[PDB]
Amino acid sequence: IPPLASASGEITKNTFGNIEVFAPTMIPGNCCLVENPVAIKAARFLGVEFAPAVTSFKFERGSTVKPVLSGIVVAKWLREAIETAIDGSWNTLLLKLRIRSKLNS
């Protein structure tokens, strides 16, 4: 059982700054895993608290294993924010703009 995310949704991560998530069990109880090529760019764009998810290991040429960062672990209450961020009607697009601005400054 991994430790829970803080109130602000901060995840506790390993030495490389990632969370290792090889089994559903490994997702914190108050968190969710969002797998998407751009889920990281999204969470960084929202400036919200997340942790990159190492879901497996890619074995590759020369001699070296590589971690597969297939996405993000965020707190549950930020799922739809993230999904909007990765995902983006008129109201949704506008509201995400409104948020992006109340957040940046």
Partner: protein, 62 residues
Amino acid sequence: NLTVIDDLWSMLIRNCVLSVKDLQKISNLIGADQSSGTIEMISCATDGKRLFMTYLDFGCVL
């Protein structure tokens, strides 16, 4: 307030009518795999039919 609505409507990169390219820019940046033919919201938003969305039409969409 009107100022708040214009700000919401003035959150692009022109300040002239919301163009198809402008809506595309916003939808592409917030993550949206939307086809060029996936105007939908903006497309339907066009009340007077000039192929763009002016302030009054933006207000009515919101």
